[PDB]
Write a protein that holds these residues in place. Structure first.
Motif, mmCIF file in Angstrom:
data_model
loop_
_atom_site.group_PDB
_atom_site.id
_atom_site.type_symbol
_atom_site.label_atom_id
_atom_site.label_comp_id
_atom_site.label_asym_id
_atom_site.label_seq_id
_atom_site.Cartn_x
_atom_site.Cartn_y
_atom_site.Cartn_z
ATOM 1 N N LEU G 147 -4.419 9.789 -18.416
ATOM 2 C CA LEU G 147 -4.404 9.932 -17.045
ATOM 3 C C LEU G 147 -3.491 9.114 -16.282
ATOM 4 O O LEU G 147 -3.387 7.986 -17.020
ATOM 5 N N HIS G 148 -3.186 9.381 -15.254
ATOM 6 C CA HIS G 148 -1.704 8.621 -14.585
ATOM 7 C C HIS G 148 -1.916 8.440 -13.154
ATOM 8 O O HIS G 148 -2.208 9.448 -12.483
ATOM 9 N N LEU G 149 -2.415 7.398 -12.769
ATOM 10 C CA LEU G 149 -2.617 6.982 -11.467
ATOM 11 C C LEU G 149 -1.369 6.781 -10.912
ATOM 12 O O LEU G 149 -0.310 6.597 -11.516
ATOM 13 N N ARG G 150 -1.138 6.897 -9.567
ATOM 14 C CA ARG G 150 0.148 6.853 -8.694
ATOM 15 C C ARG G 150 -0.224 6.344 -7.312
ATOM 16 O O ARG G 150 -0.740 6.990 -6.539
ATOM 17 N N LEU G 151 0.449 5.112 -6.814
ATOM 18 C CA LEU G 151 -0.061 4.599 -5.690
ATOM 19 C C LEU G 151 1.382 4.418 -5.140
ATOM 20 O O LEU G 151 2.265 3.757 -5.426
ATOM 21 N N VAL G 152 1.469 4.910 -3.633
ATOM 22 C CA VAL G 152 2.789 4.751 -3.122
ATOM 23 C C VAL G 152 2.297 4.262 -1.897
ATOM 24 O O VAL G 152 1.264 4.506 -0.940
ATOM 25 N N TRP G 153 3.356 3.378 -1.481
ATOM 26 C CA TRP G 153 3.688 2.664 -0.032
ATOM 27 C C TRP G 153 4.348 3.494 0.930
ATOM 28 O O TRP G 153 4.903 4.472 0.747
ATOM 29 N N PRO G 154 4.053 3.284 2.239
ATOM 30 C CA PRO G 154 5.074 3.849 3.321
ATOM 31 C C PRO G 154 6.543 3.528 3.257
ATOM 32 O O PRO G 154 7.334 4.476 3.607
ATOM 33 N N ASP G 155 6.737 2.608 2.338
ATOM 34 C CA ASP G 155 8.147 2.271 2.049
ATOM 35 C C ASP G 155 8.793 3.096 1.112
ATOM 36 O O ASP G 155 9.824 3.555 1.250
ATOM 37 N N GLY G 156 8.217 3.614 0.367
ATOM 38 C CA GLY G 156 8.385 4.682 -0.765
ATOM 39 C C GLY G 156 8.312 3.969 -2.340
ATOM 40 O O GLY G 156 8.193 4.984 -3.170
ATOM 41 N N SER G 157 8.165 2.762 -2.575
ATOM 42 C CA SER G 157 7.932 2.129 -3.763
ATOM 43 C C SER G 157 6.541 2.580 -4.303
ATOM 44 O O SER G 157 5.733 2.794 -3.625
ATOM 45 N N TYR G 158 6.444 2.413 -5.582
ATOM 46 C CA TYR G 158 5.343 2.610 -6.322
ATOM 47 C C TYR G 158 5.240 1.808 -7.593
ATOM 48 O O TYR G 158 6.057 1.405 -8.134
ATOM 49 N N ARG G 159 3.831 1.793 -8.251
ATOM 50 C CA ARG G 159 3.445 1.013 -9.293
ATOM 51 C C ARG G 159 2.545 2.224 -9.983
ATOM 52 O O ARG G 159 1.469 1.936 -9.928
ATOM 53 N N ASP G 160 3.072 2.782 -11.085
ATOM 54 C CA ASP G 160 2.348 3.919 -11.881
ATOM 55 C C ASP G 160 1.631 3.125 -12.884
ATOM 56 O O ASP G 160 1.940 2.663 -13.771
ATOM 57 N N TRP G 161 0.225 2.933 -12.812
ATOM 58 C CA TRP G 161 -0.784 2.587 -13.814
ATOM 59 C C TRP G 161 -0.985 3.828 -14.455
ATOM 60 O O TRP G 161 -1.117 4.901 -13.839
#
Lengths: 291, 49, 49, 98, 285, 237, 176, 285, 48
Positions: G147-161
């Motif tokens: 399973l792949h989480l993906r959390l994205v900010w309004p800036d556009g960056s992300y940290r895939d856990w």
């Protein structure tokens, strides 16, 4: 009597509060398990094979290994270009340099800086942030249109006078800064370069024209990447190593699944047209009642 | 009541357009001192105006 | 634009005016330079600054 | 309705006034402090019960939400805190800095 | 109460006074409905802010009281709100063609085709932008099209919504041309979408067992152009008093679904001059 | 300009209605003899939902007659369909006493006593002008039927934004409405709520005072310089 | 609370088209900071199969395993692989509670009849509420999925856990 | 607002004696032109075979509904009513009146010796609002049960519903469909009814998903639960352009219904004269 | 400023002079010649 499904779901309650982790052992997260969910009434099994876990960890090794085999291919290209020129590297950067100084020490410092940079490789580095604008949506079309626009014929006077008029001396690079003596590898930084028109060399600056002054200092070295896959290793004295970063040893889908540039999805407070000034963020905070 | 009587001459960007519309003729370059009696039927840059 | 209230309030010269077309046809097609067609009864001439 | 127009015939300043004699002070000149919880009714603490403890430690009763755009166009202002039952000194105000 | 005034601030050049008296019997909105006001409350220049929301702008315009300008005598202007039912007159500002009989409604000003963009006044910073008086079909279609921009906006990327609003932002009305300026989504647009979604789902639930197949049997037995053109987008119990109650509930759901694009009748013409400048509208404002 | 009619009220419905701050409401009845009763708004409070316990018991003593009994029976004849029979008639200009009393009711122009449980607003009553509405809601948290009636006093003249913020304040009623539709696939619950204005009044003419009939008192909010205007029965979800 | 049951009923809803099963979850301050929670816009999920690529691609293989050719005109071989990566991610539901709270007590303020075998008092500082949907095309679930989480900010960056699906369902799957 | 009407046809003393009993009746005219011929007066210029009832009712809401005041030698003085004024209207409709009834105006369905040579003298029905909404409801059901009349219990159901009821008022409302062919206005009305029902049932399943990626209300999840029960009963019952066309079709079939949905009140009755042939009333609007 | 004043001289003669300025083997000081200041204009098509 007809009892709704949401009433039984609310009166159900969670069975138990589980909590799991990730592969890298970095983020734990808590998972509920409701009793009246439809997950129970599916009658499913569980076949945990061992060689499937072996191949899954192989695919995970590939997914972590994307950028690191890219960095090791980068280092192979450094050593290959340092051999194929015989070690007589050219100067490509504008800096006032002396002659009455022993350059025996600066080569050893450049080798130590290369070793210390390879000690501190990271996912926040030069080549990844240079590749992310290339990995965009319309970067291929803009690249081929720039290729067609850089290659035009001779300007005839007919299209010079009565035709439509014609339309970039500043580039936005990316840089990795290694500090050799104090041992503080600075990972990833923006920089803006130009051709200094007194000669045919480069000049690097910050976002306010600050004229970045590390290149005078013998204690540091830097790596420059451009959005056209260019590679500039710089030791002090303005002498550089120029090459192309390779990608033949990488899968296309590896580059896609690892660090693809994201294109936006619509939400509240966002203009339906694109390329405008936006309103404020949602910002549901713990300072205000939720109104 | 036909829509056309000369399809080599009545469409935008045709032969006689690029030979006789003055806006297309500037892109090819010509003696502007020469007079062309056909261009008064092809100067749609100002027939519109 | 001019002071059309000055055209309305000031005395004029009575002329047997006639021209070739209809008056509204010459007005809607702008036979003259600048025109002004109030259609009902404007109160603007009874205001003086 | 009499429209009355005026023309100041003086070149520079031609009328000199002066505050001559004071007779009374309408404000209390007190030290009763201006409550910031009234003038910022939106700001609540992060955790709930320390916020309830702080609101109990002060005299402000509840956090009240602020009006939206249409009613603020329809109203003229907030005017939240009403008249107290004891007025023997006049109107008061005392805010400060740190 | 009714006859209100607006005290000004500046010296008044003869060009702006001429521009003011050429705008006699034209619509201006007021926020607060007071006796005397400053010039900042007149018009929409105070209320407008770019990249904030057209839907918020029409929301705050929908609550304002309208007024008609007459008898400017220097430094103030006698405004007069109209009473209900009495026949008043309106000089229009926007270039929207009118026709006799057609009810009229208020709207915010939208970007014109040729973009004449006469500010109607040149002061320090308060210009005078005006709400437009627009008939029922154009106003109903632009409210419909903005709510469809809403219901099409979500769960989408910029590319397909841009290629759809390149068609959807263009709205004609009797061979005119218009475009909607700033369709940016607001919390209120999510509110209207949520109410419309609840309304359409409630319509979907209580549909009967012959209404859901009426178009099917109709396209089976007969044939016409609107039949196939509406078909392209696609008994056992007979107790019709239950259908009476069922369609009563369907009717209140239909009026609730209709009244998220409806803006109420601000005016209705009775006589318009054939230059489309002044008309006699029998309503209040 | 006060346009005025007069109606017949029997001997068992003059109660809490001799004062000018009153409202006659024609309620269509299913029984063939009256076909309508000119009931009171304070009689609608006896089958309300915002009422307290002591507000109910005082009201059931003053409206103790067979006519009011049959009126509540015809209220319970069809639930969630009150506004299919409700009809307001402005307010009351002048009460003339009598058994079959005839009292003059102002409907338009210029000439309101409300019990405190039915008057509420979401404001600090800071509007210079205020508009009063009859807002009823149909509720199904109770296992059969809950009609809750209120008067409303808001500064929002416009209808759509007012019912938008009203359904933003009474969204739980819509939750109960969809819950009633999913828990009874045979009943047809008609509307969530009814909006009908009652003219405008001024902010400084709002007070709280003392209405007594038959030595029975009530704290009563009042809109003194009233004005009437009947934008009639609209329905919202 | 009011967000998990929606996608629970929705993954019950669309079980004909895609064969999906829900996983409701809450995340603490250990995952991300509060300024990363107060402005966060949306969450994405991906089901990467065991010895494969993903579940959004074609079933057997695709054409996007070619070498990258070290150029710009075919840097991704065209935007169709970009569209493929936009296709392989799906969007989940989202809720943010930016107050410190007790989770058992938060569910007890709702009507949730929680019955725990031990009073595990979990006290974090804010509660994001989301539902990952992991799937199995066959009705049998392989325990080597990822399973792949993906959390994205309004800036556009992300940290895939991301995490495998074995420690997730080692107990509750066996508790059926 | 006084309107003179004339007659190019001759009027004998029997004709005006037939006319003079209609001293104040609700008569419609298209617009407020001053001196108007009687061919524009009356509903006769709209009613034909292929137009029907619903088209006529749509033509009713934009006309003006004036009141007769007096009769002269060869001109009729109509007084157009205004808001605030009360008038003594004589009843023309079949239905009785009561105190406090909000009234509406309807086309005459079936119904006294009032004619003119090749010009049908026709005045609209005045009715209480409950019978108005009930008759639009019943006539829409009778339009929905038009094509499926091969059986008997559908014919017996229409036979049950052809008789309307009220307080001492039973009428046979006429069948809009004749020889299994309906009139095109009612056909398009029930077509739009079935179309908005089918489009709601086929689009709310995507739009609750498209909305609910935002904040999720308990109202929204119970709406989705209701959609799950509706999809269960459906399953026991057995490219941006398509949703763009679906939404625009949804809202145009919404838009073409408010003339059957919104029933704007015209009169509000006051004290009634006995025999119930006339009544005083406040005109609303 | 250059992008501004190129958006005003978009007739044939101005850009013809611009092409003529940068074509020979000379600089501008043996190409140009100064006269002074203009005070009047007749402004036909061929002005004066």
């Amino acid at each position: 009597d007809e009892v709704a499904r949401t009433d039984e779901w609310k009166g159900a309650g969670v069975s138990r509060l589980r909590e799991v982790w990730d592969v890298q052992h970095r983020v734990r997260l808590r998972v509920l398990w409701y009793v009246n969910s439809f997950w129970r009434s599916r009658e499913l099994s569980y076949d945990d094979h061992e060689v499937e876990l072996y191949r899954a960890l192989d695919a995970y090794r590939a997914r972590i290994a994307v950028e690191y085999v890219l960095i090791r291919a980068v280092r192979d290209e450094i050593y290959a270009v340092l051999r194929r020129d015989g070690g007589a590297l050219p100067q490509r950067f504008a800096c006032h340099v002396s002659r009455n100084m022993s350059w025996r020490v600066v080569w050893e410092l450049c080798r130590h800086a290369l070793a210390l940079w390879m000690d501190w490789a990271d996912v926040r580095s030069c080549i990844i942030k240079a590749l992310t604008p290339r990995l965009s949506r319309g970067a291929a079309a803009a690249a081929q249109r720039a290729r067609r626009q850089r290659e035009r014929s001779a300007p005839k006077p007919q299209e010079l006078l009565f035709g439509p008029r014609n339309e970039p001396a500043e580039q936005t690079w990316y840089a990795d800064v290694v500090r050799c003596v104090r041992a503080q590898v600075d990972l990833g930084v923006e920089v803006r370069a130009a051709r200094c028109p007194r000669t045919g060399l480069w000049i690097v600056r910050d976002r306010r024209g600050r004229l970045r002054r590390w290149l005078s200092q013998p204690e540091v070295c830097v790596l420059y990447v451009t959005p056209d896959l260019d590679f500039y290793w710089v030791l002090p004295g303005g002498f550089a190593v120029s090459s192309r970063v390779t990608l033949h040893g990488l899968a296309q889908r590896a580059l896609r699944d690892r660090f693809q540039n994201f294109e936006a999805v619509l939400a509240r407070g966002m203009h339906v047209e694109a390329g405008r000034q936006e309103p404020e963020t949602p910002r549901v905070s713990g300072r205000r009642l939720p109104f | 009541f036909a829509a056309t009587h000369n399809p080599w001459a009545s469409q935008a960007g045709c032969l006689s357009d690029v030979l006789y519309n003055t806006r297309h003729r500037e892109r090819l370059g010509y003696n502007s001192k020469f007079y062309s009696p056909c261009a008064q039927y092809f100067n749609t840059e100002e027939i519109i105006a | 634009m001019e002071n059309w209230s000055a055209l309305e309030l000031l005395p004029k010269v009575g002329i047997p005016t006639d021209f070739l077309t209809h008056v509204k046809t010459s007005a809607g097609e702008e036979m003259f330079e600048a025109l002004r067609i109030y259609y009902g009864d404007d109160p603007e001439r009874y205001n003086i600054h | 309705t009499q429209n009355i127009n005026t023309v100041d015939m003086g070149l520079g300043y031609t009328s000199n006034t002066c505050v001559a004699y004071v007779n009374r002070v309408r404000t209390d000149m007190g030290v009763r402090v201006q409550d910031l919880f009234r003038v910022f009714p939106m700001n609540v603490y992060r955790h709930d019960e320390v916020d309830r403890w702080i609101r109990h430690a002060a005299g402000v009763e509840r956090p009240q939400l602020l009006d939206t755009e249409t009613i603020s166009m329809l109203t003229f202002g907030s005017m939240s805190e009403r008249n107290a039952a004891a007025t023997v000194h006049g109107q008061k105000a005392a805010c400060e800095l740190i | 109460e009714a006859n209100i005034f607006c005290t000004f601030d500046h010296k008044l050049s003869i060009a702006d006074v001429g521009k003011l008296t050429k705008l006699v019997a034209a619509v201006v909105p007021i926020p607060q409905r007071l006796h005397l006001i400053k010039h900042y409350q007149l018009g929409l220049h105070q209320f407008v802010d770019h990249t904030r929301g057209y839907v918020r702008l029409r929301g705050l315009l929908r609550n304002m009281t309208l007024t008609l300008m007459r008898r400017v005598e220097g430094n103030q202007i006698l405004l007069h709100v109209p009473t209900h039912g009495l026949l008043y007159t309106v000089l229009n500002t926007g270039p929207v063609t009118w026709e006799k009989g057609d009810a009229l409604c208020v709207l915010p000003p939208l970007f014109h085709g040729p973009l004449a963009r006469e500010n109607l006044l040149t002061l320090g910073q308060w210009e005078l932008v005006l709400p437009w008086i627009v008939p029922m079909p154009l106003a109903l279609e632009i409210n419909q099209r903005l709510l469809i921009m809403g219901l099409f906006s979500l769960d989408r990327s910029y590319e397909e919504v841009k290629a759809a609003v390149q068609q959807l932002q263009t709205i004609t009305f009797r061979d005119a041309t218009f475009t909607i300026p700033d369709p940016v989504i607001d919390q209120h647009l999510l509110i209207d979408m949520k109410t419309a979604c609840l309304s359409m789902s409630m319509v979907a639930n209580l549909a009967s067992e012959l209404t859901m197949t009426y178009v099917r049997k109709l396209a089976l037995e007969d044939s016409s152009m609107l039949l196939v053109k509406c078909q392209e987008l696609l008994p056992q119990h007979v107790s019709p008093d239950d259908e009476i109650a069922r369609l009563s509930a369907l009717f209140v759901m239909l009026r609730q679904l209709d009244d998220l694009i409806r803006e109420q009748v601000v005016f209705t013409v009775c006589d318009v001059s054939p230059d489309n400048k002044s008309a006699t509208c029998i309503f209040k404002g | 300009q006060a346009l005025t009619a007069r109606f017949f009220v029997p001997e068992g419905l003059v109660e809490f209605e001799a004062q000018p701050g009153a409202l006659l409401i024609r309620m269509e009845t299913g029984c063939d003899s009256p076909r309508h009763l000119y009931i009171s708004l304070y009689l609608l409070g006896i089958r309300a939902s915002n009422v307290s316990a002591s507000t109910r018991c005082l009201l059931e003593s003053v409206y103790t007659a067979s006519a009011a009994r049959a009126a509540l029976q015809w209220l319970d004849l069809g639930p969630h369909l009150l506004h299919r029979r409700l009809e307001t008639l402005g307010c009351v200009k002048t009460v003339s006493l009598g058994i079959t009393s005839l009292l003059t009711c102002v409907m338009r122009g210029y000439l309101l006593m409300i019990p405190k449980d039915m008057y509420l607003t979401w404001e600090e009553t800071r509007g210079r002008l205020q508009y009063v509405y009859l807002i009823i809601v149909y509720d199904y948290d109770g296992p059969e039927t809950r009609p809750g009636i209120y008067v409303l006093t808001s500064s929002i003249a416009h209808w759509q934004t007012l019912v938008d913020v009203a359904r933003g304040k009474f969204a739980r009623e819509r939750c109960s409405f969809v819950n009633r539709r999913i828990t009874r696939p045979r009943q047809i619950p008609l509307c969530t709520g009814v909006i009908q204005k009652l003219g405008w009044c001024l902010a400084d003419d709002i007070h709280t005072s003392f209405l007594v009939h038959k030595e029975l008192k009530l704290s009563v909010v009042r809109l003194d310089n009233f004005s009437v205007e009947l934008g009639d029965f609209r329905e919202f979800v | 609370m009011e967000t998990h049951l929606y996608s629970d009923l929705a993954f019950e809803a669309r079980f004909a088209d895609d064969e999906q099963l829900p996983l409701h979850l809450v995340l603490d301050q250990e995952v991300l900071s509060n300024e990363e929670a107060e402005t966060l816009r949306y969450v994405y999920y991906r089901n990467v199969d065991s010895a494969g690529r993903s579940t959004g691609r074609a079933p057997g293989g695709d054409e996007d395993d070619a070498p990258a050719s070290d150029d710009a005109e075919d840097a991704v071989g065209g935007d169709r692989a970009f569209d493929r990566e936009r296709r392989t991610w799906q969007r989940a539901c989202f809720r943010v509670l930016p107050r410190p709270l007790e989770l058992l007590d938060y569910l007890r303020q709702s009507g949730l009849t929680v019955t725990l075998e031990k009073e595990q008092r979990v006290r974090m500082f804010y509660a994001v509420f989301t539902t990952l949907g992991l799937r199995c095309p066959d009705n049998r679930l392989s325990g080597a999925q990822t399973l792949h989480l993906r959390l994205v900010w309004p800036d556009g960056s992300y940290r895939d856990w991301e995490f495998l699906a074995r420690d997730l369902l080692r107990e509750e799957m066996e508790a059926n």
